[PDB]
Symmetry: D2
Subunit: 298 residues, 4 copies
């Protein structure tokens, strides 16, 4: 009944069996769990926060100079209330790290993001193995399924944003389930603003400090033949706090072939991960014959 | 073997049967035909041209003032070669004409577009009836199928554009078939730059003056159970000329139910026109369960 | 020492002289004053609020559908935290009201904005007359100076926005003085977030309900030969509240000739209002000879 | 009377004096000259062309995939005539080369741009010395004036563009003089489309192959106390050809102090180059007191 909050270090000790049973239960009945004692140092997370926030502040300062100047163009005084406070960019890590070639980051920043990205990779694969165990599969199974030819895709979206101006503005807002593998979310403050649908109703992720919030995608549901369902959610920015998010995605390689583990077995489909995303981006129906085939299906 | 060029007025005379046989043949074996003597006055088309071109010239003059000024911002001299010469906007006509409320047109312009849009509607419905006849269907059949509840959607895209900088830039460019009903294309100059794929190869639409180029969409293929195929094409702007296009679309109403005429009967599907477009815009797979169903299909 | 809060209705009564003396004092020593009892009904302001907020909510709902869909394009899940919550548009009123032809407002909205704009015009001209009186000028003087040929320019910027994500983000943010005539600001809630520089330090506009905040521009400083200085300010969106602003500007007509009243007399310049703005938009130096003349000046 | 076309290699020979006299005459009476035999190999220019064109073609292919996909979003078929064929980016070279960190260039491309940028720098400084000589100044004088503290700013704008859709669209288009030092323009084909105003009328730059077109900016006019005037021009893309431009700018360092050479001496002003550009970008009047000072000047 309570949202799973899990002290990962307990898997090294006498409490392991009960921690694995929480992980199992979250996987089966929540789709989500919040990790503490997960092995990424407080100091590293605090540095990632500070520096991301430093870069945000800079791009905001620059962005106001530019608003003032374009607005002057149209014979218009730009106010600070005209600001767009949302800023988001990505960083690839696997198979090829583009961290070196993304515009406008300090070197000291890129190296911090590098290290942090290696740490979370390592954490992800550990999590996948513990899922394997609970699941009766072999160590490495999911990392292997996710491998494809060149490897799993892994990146981190880095967001900075203001609070929602009022909750009823979210009233009518569609949620989703994530299409990929396993997602690890790192935020600032105490309140995420992250919510999951459970039995028709919205449950808040409980505020923690130095936590990582883990959730399973569509792909893990297929490989488990539905045993672990990817779950609907949303994330709304609270006046309370959490103005920054790092959402890192450990997804199957583009060419990877996804399908329910034979041991774990209606039957979920088999398919190449990239075709799941091409369905997703709307690039599987820009021809006529596909389209006619789909309307015959409905 | 020759692209169909059809003098529509001949349907009023002793030559009708041979003109209907061209229309039939184009419908079956070209998907396209070029109309002359189609009953829209030379004077009306020439006014539509002039005025569209007048409005283009204005939005270009304005657009250079703004480029000069934003470029100055970044300590940069804007050249005329920095110009974006492409300009396109739409006009609705049916079920509700938004021609009155589109920004930045002269009144004298809106009224010309109104009249012109009534004329082409009338021409479209005539064309659909002549298709009915060739097809063995009743007068009004297609207009009726297209009606839905509120009526057929009808609008005109108005484009102005420079020439392609070089043909091999189009080399690797995907074509398409139109998703809607029947399309009537009005251009300037002599060379369209419009091409259709016929038996694997690119055929140019032959240059004519005061012509209208007609082509059938995906919807007419379904209602004819494949007898009239919608055909692949593209349109590339020629150094030769044709720098302006008015493409008017007479499509089924959103809620209209499309399906192969029982008389005209594998079997094509039945479906609501709006679901064909939602497939098209990529809004039918932004949930997980649809997506899993589609991968099981492949 | 206290920010001027002025009950306008008191100019109809035994307290007039003391209210005029507040207006005089604010004009001379604050540049700003907050009006209550100003003669625009509570019901009208409350309707303007509600309806603006209704339109905001709609454009936000629509804006999230579009973010979800474009983000899907790039194989990316749009979150609600990716939202851009800032929305701003204008409405002209004088010399020609474009309220009828601005995209996407209910009719019931346009009529409310019309009425409201007539009311504030009337309030502005009253304020200018009371300035005349305090100043020793004739009734109508400033309205007349502002008239030019076709009339004074009058419009309203309508803004909706989230809170600033954190105050130190404003830390390093340039303020300004308004370039025009007289500005009347209508907000929601209680806290504006509006601040004025007075003797080197930031003073908050005091929270009021159904207030209008008035401030004088650069133009009124010139006509008063510096007696009424236009004052520096800024406006920052508070977590506390005030998520909406209507800032209406009563400025001199484009062709109006601005210059210190002979009675009110270094000497401020004389000039056409439009040249002050062209200086402002950076369109007075896009040629070489101007530029050389300015560097010789410095 | 004829546009100056100058074989630079002749400065190494018996013809030097007559070539220097052409350079002198162009500097005094044309502001522009076209260089051939200028010492940048045919092979290097041809490689720069090919590779720029290869990169253009790629960004165009990518840009059409994205248009098709966003247009589908709005239930709209993207045509090739909807294309925006204009593409432009910059490359810094001095004081710090950002060529390594600009997005989406082949390595083999960056190295070609590096070399090419060193070659043109070397050519620029040579040209400045020959100007010194004609002028009676010492070798290095202008390079030294341009040096400031960190060095001269040097970069190259790289443009690719379609033809102007029709000449009367340029009819009403403002020209300019360049604000910087000395500009070297490298194009493809034969016809630039570049024109200079000379005695009130438009003169075309004569078509040449493997030419470089040189022109003097506002800064060189000041240092020569008007002896060498920077001249008005424009560049329009011809159906004839020249679809690519590399415009490289050798300007004074930001902090450089520009002023008429004492030997060369109304008197032109003295000033820091960056203040000339800040005048230019419209950032010298975003405060009130500047503005009042300027209106008193007029
Ligand atoms: Fe998500
Ligand atoms: Fe088409
Ligand atoms: Fe202001
Ligand atoms: Fe130029």
């Amino acid at each position: 009944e309570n949202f799973p909050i899990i002290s990962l270090d307990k898997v090294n000790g006498v409490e392991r069996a009960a921690t694995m049973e929480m992980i199992k239960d979250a996987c089966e009945n929540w789709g989500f769990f919040e990790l503490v004692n997960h092995g990424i140092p407080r100091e590293v997370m605090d540095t990632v926060e500070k520096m991301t926030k430093g870069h945000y502040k800079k791009c905001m300062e620059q962005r106001f100079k530019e608003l003032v100047a374009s607005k002057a163009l149209e014979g218009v005084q730009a106010e600070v209330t005209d600001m767009d406070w949302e800023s988001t960019f990505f960083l690839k890590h696997l198979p090829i790290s583009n961290i070196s070639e993304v515009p406008d980051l300090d070197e000291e920043y890129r190296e911090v993001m590098r290290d942090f990205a290696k740490r979370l990779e390592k954490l992800a694969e550990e999590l996948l193995d513990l899922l394997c165990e609970n699941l009766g599969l072999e160590k490495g199974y999911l990392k292997n399924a996710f491998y494809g030819s060149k490897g799993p895709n892994f990146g981190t979206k880095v967001s900075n944003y203001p609070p929602c101006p009022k909750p009823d503005l979210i009233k009518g807002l569609r949620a989703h389930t994530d299409a990929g593998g396993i997602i690890l979310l790192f935020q600032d403050d105490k309140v995420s603003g992250l919510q999951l649908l459970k039995d028709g109703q919205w449950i808040d992720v409980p505020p923690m400090r130095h936590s990582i919030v883990v959730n399973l995608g569509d792909q893990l549901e297929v490989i488990t033949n539905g045993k672990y369902k990817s779950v609907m959610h949303r994330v709304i920015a609270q006046k309370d706090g959490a103005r920054m998010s790092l959402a890192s995605f450990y997804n199957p390689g583009s060419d990877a072939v996804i399908y329910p583990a034979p041991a774990l077995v209606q039957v979920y489909p088999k398919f190449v991960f990239d075709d799941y995303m091409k369905l997703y981006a709307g690039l599987k129906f820009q021809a006529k014959e596909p389209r006619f085939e789909a309307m015959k299906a409905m």
